Design a protein around this ligand. Structure first.
Ligand SMILES: NC(=O)[C@@H](N)Cc1ccc(O)cc1
Length: 83
């Protein structure tokens, strides 16, 4: 029985709010609306659960989404943690 992993969106003071949104759309197939809501959830409370899936997939999507911010000169960070 594989363990499932939460992909966590973390907060920072630098990454633009709308950039986080379009990342969430592109990588996690969220709409504009859901993207804003999740993005703001991290914005206020420090973090937010984006998705929960198999480990290897969680790691892949966390890396992709983080690399988008990274190569843009942003500290945007997606992590995985187990449940
Ligand atoms: N520009 C800002 O004010 C950031 N707090 C926006 C942001 C929200 C959520 C995040 O996971 C990351 C960044």
């Amino acid at each position: 029985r594989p363990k499932l992993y939460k992909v966590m969106l973390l907060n920072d003071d630098y990454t633009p709010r709308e950039f986080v949104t379009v990342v969430l759309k592109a990588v996690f197939r969220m709409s504009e609306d859901t993207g804003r809501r999740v993005m703001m959830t991290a914005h206020r409370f420090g973090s937010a659960v984006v998705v929960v899936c198999e480990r290897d997939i969680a790691e892949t999507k966390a890396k992709e989404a983080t690399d988008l911010g990274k190569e843009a000169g942003f500290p945007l960070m997606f992590t995985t943690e187990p449940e």
